[PDB]
Design a protein around this ligand. Structure first.
Ligand SMILES: CCOc1cc(C2CCN(C)CC2)ccc1Nc1ncc2c(n1)N(Cc1ccccc1)[C@H](CC)C(=O)N2C
Length: 124
């Protein structure tokens, strides 16, 4: 079975607007979402649909950009680092489940490089 998706909304968590969190949604998530390599990463891995019975045996910390978009837009994150960590988890999950030089790995690497170019310009 798939697990439930990660938590994305908690009314009890405190909420703040920051330049960094706005940039992570309006620039970083927007840019990666619209990339031609984004489609595998726009939603949780559906291991039932894809017939990957080992995916959630290997990947115990699932993450994806659909979840990251929800966390940003629901003010789930207090620290920009929480969001950056989730992007890193998503890329590393792909590197863990797959093998060096696989097509999906190259796609994740290209998205990670663009992520890093955008995080480079994270405002003060
Ligand atoms: C066979 C159909 O595959 C997909 C279709 C859609 C569509 C994309 C367009 N949207 C509008 C609707 C969902 C989204 C995602 C997938 N596939 C998919 N998602 C995530 C990953 C992924 N594949 N693969 C590639 C793979 C698939 C099958 C067997 C071996 C490796 C790997 C393993 C799950 C991966 O790491 N990711 C994140």
């Amino acid at each position: 079975m798939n697990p439930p998706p990660p938590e994305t909304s908690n009314p009890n968590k405190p909420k703040r607007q920051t330049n960094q969190l706005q940039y992570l949604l309006r620039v970083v998530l927007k840019t990666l979402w619209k990339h031609q390599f984004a489609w595998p990463f726009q939603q949780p891995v559906d291991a039932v649909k894809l017939n990957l019975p080992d995916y959630y045996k290997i990947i115990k910390t699932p993450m994806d950009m659909g979840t990251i978009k929800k966390r940003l837009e629901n003010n789930y994150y207090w620290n920009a680092q929480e969001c950056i960590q989730d992007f890193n988890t998503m890329f590393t999950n792909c590197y863990i489940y797959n093998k060096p030089g696989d097509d999906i790995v190259l796609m994740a690497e290209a998205l990670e490089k663009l992520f890093l170019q955008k995080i480079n310009e994270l405002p003060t």
